[PDB]
């Protein structure tokens, strides 16, 4: 019989049962997206998107609904900060229920196309064989793709008939869903400019409509049909797998590097926003803009938003968890209750010491307090006997500005050293390690997990592209090579050209 | 018979080294990369990207030469010679790590060109393209490590450098920072590579010691002409040898040689999945259940927590030198040190 890995190859010469197996895959995918969002609703704590947003709770598909306008629940909560809203039908519940209702409907359609495989539409009229016109099928689907690319860009994304998309300020503080106008100049190829994401879909939708119309009315060349074996549908498989791994490589990058499509209020900070100290520079940019107004440090730091200082914390870096450190980010550090404040470290000299922040490579990192002139002035020592720069020796005190501990100064070096090992993580936050048994072991965000799946899928789909392109170009030979393969066929210099029997 | 057919004739012309259509993409790019490795390991320093000596011109030997990665400040810059960082200047381009990206991208394109060659030759000699399918495992290792891993990290700097000791840096980097031994995807690669090397050694010695006596000489290699259609060795004896020595034996010579294709290629594909995870620092660094056990019990020692103590040694002793851009100034007292060393 068939090998176990070849069991689905009963659908190549069965296009009606190929449609049914596809309808069932699409039913399971739409069923998962409904099932995942309903499970995500059952575990989402929505009452604090400042210090416990969706990317802290491991909300996988809650940001993908959010980034295209779905903002409220029938429960009453909106993710943007309000409660009591009626967002109509398209809630996180109604979207998820629409995906389950779709999945039952694609199920019964798959049940219909499985029993009624033997439609004359698949049968070729000139030879009675079940045949798919894959060039004409492609232009039909390319026309439909560009119709749904244009209309998503020019109605949904523009907001003219549609919600828009998730827009942000660069530091992700007051990000919401707005209509976005298309960017038609060169700034539309900036991936962080959302006007290009709208203007892509308008423009690529038209070009896909134009090309969809092309591949309907223009037939393939006789030499392009035969190079690709366009009669076979394994070539549609090998070039579509080629597309989806390119596309999964792109979404792995634009999730990891960040784009306008992947905002930080929904998927979290990127790892490169911690590498650059991109929020630390902004936090100090605001503080010095009040240190020149005359506003003192306790004042000039109690105006930093708690959401902004939460982005400047290494437990929100997606390059900080681990492959089996499972679950939400709140399973790691915890649920952030409040900002403890900006720890300013001063020695017994009263001169300000700056903690060497930890890079995302490091599991452990020594606590080392440099000054503005770079020279190391204090550290928590490993070997403490021959030490010179301990917190006890150099008299290091810690003062907090803003946050919970606004106007508190700790001078006793055990309490200074505890806050110093948390100041290598950035801004120090008070975590609830009691809601969900948070063991301190750092976790990954939905930004980091999505990149892992979709760059490991894209690599696994690189092999699938290779395998199915091998199956296409070598279709005569996957039972084996010819028994009547001549020894003079692969012998050198029996033919002037490799492969051709007329060049002897 | 126009110019595409005529160029198809000359490219697929039966010669010493087969050019083909892939040779337009293989033969410059595989030669620029390997020619650029030798150019970088002979003549190009790492004195501005890494602060290292890495050429024969400076005093390094074949073990210690490398084409080192770009600086971390370059990021994932493509570092074209005409690009905004080199600005055309070849002397500046070698100093900024431009030859690393020259090798990592031409070598990327040549490996496509060699894998396409394996398709193109198998289409002309009439055989199945399983060598191309088996070459997917060196592609996925080159793609995950030299390209995908730095793309997941902050720059090209954390990719491995094209050098013997620089790879050795990269192996010891991944132990200290990633605990890559403990990762289960690397163990499937070790089981695949050492399984491949075992199945190379076993099948090689099994065939060579089950040979049929076809020649009257005591050196058996001249008892084989290739146009013959006999089995040159006794697969029946070979199956009865291993069934009583080891317990199990292949009895299908086609399944044996598929298993020889399967085992190092699945191993190197599993190591790829781990390195793609390590691009995002998704390590199997710690068993959370044991460091919960060992942090409130100071007598529970396993070899696991000993390896983690070694990784803290690597991550603090290597990093002020391995990562010069960070300006790690680790004092002589923050360094994790056991007693007397």
């Amino acid at each position: 019989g068939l090998p176990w890995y070849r069991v689905h190859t009963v659908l190549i010469n069965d296009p009606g049962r190929l449609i049914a197996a596809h309808l069932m895959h699409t039913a399971l995918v739409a069923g998962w997206a409904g099932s995942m969002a309903l499970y995500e609703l059952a575990t989402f704590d929505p009452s604090d998107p400042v210090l416990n947003p969706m990317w802290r709770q491991g909300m996988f598909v809650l940001p993908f609904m959010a980034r295209l306008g779905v903002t409220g629940s029938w429960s009453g909560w909106s993710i943007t900060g309000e409660t009591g809203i009626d967002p109509g039908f398209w809630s996180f519940e109604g979207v998820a229920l629409a995906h389950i209702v779709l999945s039952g409907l694609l199920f019964l359609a798959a049940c219909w196309h499985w029993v009624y495989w033997d439609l004359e539409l698949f049968r070729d009229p000139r030879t009675g064989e079940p045949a798919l016109d894959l060039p004409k099928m492609f232009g039909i689907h390319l026309f439909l793709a560009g119709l749904l690319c244009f209309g998503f860009g020019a109605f949904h994304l523009t907001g003219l008939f549609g919600p828009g998309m998730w827009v942000s300020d660069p530091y992700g503080l007051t990000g919401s869903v707005q209509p976005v106008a298309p960017e038609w100049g060169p700034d539309g190829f900036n991936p962080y400019n959302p006007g290009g994401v709208v203007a892509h879909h308008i423009a690529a939708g038209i070009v896909g409509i134009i090309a969809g119309l092309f591949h309907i009315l223009v037939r393939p060349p006789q030499r392009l049909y035969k190079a690709l074996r366009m009669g076979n549908i394994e070539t549609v498989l090998s070039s579509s797998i080629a597309a989806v791994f390119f596309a999964a490589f792109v979404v792995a990058g634009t999730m990891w590097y960040g784009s306008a499509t992947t905002p930080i209020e929904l998927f979290g900070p990127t790892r490169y926003q911690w590498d650059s100290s991109y929020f630390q520079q902004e936090i100090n940019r605001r503080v010095q803009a009040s240190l020149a107004s005359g506003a003192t440090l306790e004042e000039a730091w109690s105006a930093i938003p708690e959401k902004l200082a939460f982005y400047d914390y290494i437990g929100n870096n997606p390059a900080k968890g681990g492959l089996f450190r499972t679950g939400p980010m709140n399973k790691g550090d915890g649920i952030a209750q409040a900002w403890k404040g900006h720890a300013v470290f001063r020695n017994k000299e009263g001169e300000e010491l700056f903690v060497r922040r930890m890079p995302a490579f490091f599991e452990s990192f020594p606590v080392i307090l440099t000054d503005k002139n770079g020279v190391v002035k204090a550290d928590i020592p490993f070997r403490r006997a021959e030490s010179k720069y301990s917190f006890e020796q150099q008299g290091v005190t810690v003062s907090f500005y803003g946050g919970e501990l606004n106007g508190q100064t700790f001078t006793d070096p055990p309490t200074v050293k505890s806050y110093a090992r948390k100041a290598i993580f950035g801004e120090i936050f008070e975590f609830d390690t009691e809601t969900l048994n948070s063991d301190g072991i750092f976790r990954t965000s939905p930004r980091g997990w999505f990149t892992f799946a979709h760059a490991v899928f894209a690599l696994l789909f690189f092999f699938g592209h290779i395998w199915h392109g091998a199956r296409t170009l070598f279709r005569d030979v996957f039972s084996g090579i010819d028994p009547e393969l001549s020894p003079e066929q692969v012998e050198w210099g029996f033919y002037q050209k490799v492969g051709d029997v007329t060049t002897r | 018979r126009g110019w595409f057919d005529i160029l198809d004739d000359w490219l697929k012309r039966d010669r010493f080294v087969f050019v083909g259509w892939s040779g337009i993409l293989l033969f410059p790019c595989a030669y620029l990369a390997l020619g650029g490795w030798l150019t970088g390991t002979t003549f190009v320093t790492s004195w501005y990207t890494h602060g290292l000596a890495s050429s024969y011109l400076e005093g390094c030997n074949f073990l210690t030469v490398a084409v080192s990665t770009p600086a971390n400040s370059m990021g994932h810059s493509l570092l074209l010679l005409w690009g905004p960082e080199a600005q055309g200047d070849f002397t500046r381009w070698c100093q900024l790590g431009g030859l690393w990206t020259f090798i990592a991208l031409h070598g990327a394109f040549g490996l496509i060109g060699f894998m396409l060659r394996q398709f193109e030759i198998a289409r002309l000699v009439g055989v199945r393209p399983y060598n191309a399918i088996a070459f997917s495992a060196p592609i996925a290792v080159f793609v995950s490590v030299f390209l995908i891993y730095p793309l997941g990290q902050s720059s090209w700097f954390f990719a491995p450098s094209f050098g013997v000791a620089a790879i050795f840096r990269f192996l010891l980097f991944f132990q200290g920072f990633h605990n890559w031994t403990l990762n289960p995807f690397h163990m499937m690669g070790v089981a695949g590579v050492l399984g491949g090397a075992l199945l190379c050694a076993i099948h090689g010695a099994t065939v060579e010691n089950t040979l049929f006596q076809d020649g009257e000489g005591a050196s058996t290699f001249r008892a084989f002409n290739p146009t013959q259609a006999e089995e040159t060795y006794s697969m029946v004896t070979a199956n009865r040898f291993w069934s009583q020595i080891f317990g199990i034996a292949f009895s299908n010579k086609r399944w044996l040689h598929f298993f020889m294709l399967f085992v190092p290629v699945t191993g190197l594909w599993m190591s790829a999945i781990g390195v793609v995870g390590l691009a995002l620092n998704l390590r199997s660094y710690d068993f959370i259940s044991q460091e919960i056990r060992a942090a409130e019990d100071p007598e529970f020692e396993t070899f696991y927590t000993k390896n983690l103590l070694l990784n803290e040694g690597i991550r603090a002793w290597m990093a002020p030198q391995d990562q010069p851009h960070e300006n790690f100034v680790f004092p002589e007292e923050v360094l994790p040190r056991g007693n007397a060393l």
Binding site: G1, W4, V7, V10 | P184, I288
Partner: peptide, 30 residues
């Protein structure tokens, strides 16, 4: 079409799974 799975493929495919789960159980319990 019938599916054929000979006993060696039951034996290797169980070997493939059990040594996969002997590997990954240390990480699934973590």
């Amino acid at each position: 079409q019938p599916v054929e799975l000979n006993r060696t493929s039951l034996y290797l495919g169980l070997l493939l799974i059990l040594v996969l789960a002997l590997l990954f159980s240390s990480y699934f319990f973590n």
